[PDB]
Structure 1
Amino acid sequence: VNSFSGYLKLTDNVYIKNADIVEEAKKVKPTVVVNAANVYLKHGGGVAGALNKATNNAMQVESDDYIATNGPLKVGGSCVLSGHNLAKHCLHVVGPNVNKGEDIQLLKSAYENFNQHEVLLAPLLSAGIFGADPIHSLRVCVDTVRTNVYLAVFDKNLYDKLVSSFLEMKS
């Protein structure tokens, strides 16, 4: 388990790889894969849709059952459900939807949930459908997370941009 390979070490606890999070999860077998979730755990597109699709929709059914007895998550909040065939556990974390004016400071709260887990395979929270700048999401991850986070960025051009601007800013 947690056999991560081919990552660029950004800090003592943050790693980044140009990879699709589903394919990484199948290779690595992480204890925790992170979902970029929304408060009702409707796994439509992006990471959530890809993770759910790779579980043959088991993640959505599990999530419906969770919501039915617990109600929606809060923005910046999280829950631990099954990792299905992809991981031991999936940490569903709700970043703020910046497009709808949700407070971008909640991205800090979202990444704080990573600190409850020794090691995680994760995407850049809020950087896709939710409209936060990916460079900002990476910065918040680096400053907030103290546990071992392995970031999967599937798009090569975004990966190159993220690494370049991480170096520039780091000084």
Structure 2
Amino acid sequence: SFSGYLKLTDNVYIKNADIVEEAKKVKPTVVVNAANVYLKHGGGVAGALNKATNNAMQVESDDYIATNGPLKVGGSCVLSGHNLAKHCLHVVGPNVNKGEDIQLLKSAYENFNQHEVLLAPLLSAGIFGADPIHSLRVCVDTVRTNVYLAVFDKNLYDKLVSSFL
């Protein structure tokens, strides 16, 4: 039911879309969140997905952290997708603005391989400070499952498509 996507590879698709609106429309099995290790969904994609759940994602996340402790950078956890998806896969890409190792981006994308189909943002892009062109390259070279990438910014989407090798 994903519509309007440009096919980049056998398994990677891309669209200029707000991932919240895309999730509300498709109600995919899995929506990926651009999470941090504490699951504090303050801004970027995380803040937007959490706001769309009326903070239910944050309440569930705080209980998860209270029980399990923080995630690792490069790691993930599966929680409810609330009103957006069946599940939310909270994936922690390295935050270059926190001085985290960009080399952990491949480990972060490997989490996507545990799900046959996902709606996702580019990991470590936006407020996480990594080059989105590099994130897309790591995505295509790491993810083997079917990933539908939503890129909020039109200008960035055009740059990503036009520079895709």
- On whether the aligned pair clears a TM of 0.5, the verdict is yes
How far residue 112 of structure 1 moved from its aligned partner, in angstroms, is: 0.2
How far residue 29 of structure 1 moved from its aligned partner, in angstroms, is: 1.1
SS at match of 2:150: strand
Moved over 4 A (4+): none
Over aligned residues, Cα RMSD in angstroms?
0.6
SS at match of 1:96: coil
How far residue 129 of structure 1 moved from its aligned partner, in angstroms, is: 1.4
Give TM-score, length-normalised by structure 1: 0.95
Q: How far, CA to CA, are the matches of 1:99 and 1:87 in structure 2?
A: 29
SS at match of 1:105: helix
Q: How far, CA to CA, are the matches of 1:136 and 1:126 in structure 2?
A: 10
How far residue 113 of structure 1 moved from its aligned partner, in angstroms, is: 0.1
How far residue 154 of structure 1 moved from its aligned partner, in angstroms, is: 1.1
> Residues 11-44 of structure 1: CA distance to partner in whole angstroms, max 9, x if unpaired?
0000000100000001111000000000000000
How far residue 100 of structure 1 moved from its aligned partner, in angstroms, is: 2.4
How far residue 101 of structure 1 moved from its aligned partner, in angstroms, is: 2.0
Q: How far, CA to CA, are the matches of 2:60 and 2:98 in structure 1?
A: 27
Q: How far, CA to CA, are the matches of 2:108 and 2:20 in structure 1?
A: 21
> Residues 99-139 of structure 1: CA distance to partner in whole angstroms, max 9, x if unpaired?
22211110000000000000000001111111000000000
> Residues 49-82 of structure 1: CA distance to partner in whole angstroms, max 9, x if unpaired?
0100000000000000000000000000000000
Q: How far, CA to CA, are the matches of 1:132 and 1:82 in structure 2?
A: 27
Q: How far, CA to CA, are the matches of 1:150 and 1:70 in structure 2?
A: 29
Q: How far, CA to CA, are the matches of 1:128 and 1:26 in structure 2?
A: 21
Partner residue of 1:33?
31
Q: 1:45-84 maps to which residues of 2 (within 5 A)?
A: 45-84=43-82
How far residue 87 of structure 1 moved from its aligned partner, in angstroms, is: 0.2
Give TM-score, length-normalised by structure 2: 0.99
> Residues 71-98 of structure 1: CA distance to partner in whole angstroms, max 9, x if unpaired?
0000000000000000000000000011
SS at match of 2:97: helix
SS at match of 1:4: coil
Identity across the alignment (%): 100
Q: How far, CA to CA, are the matches of 1:17 and 1:164 in structure 2?
A: 13
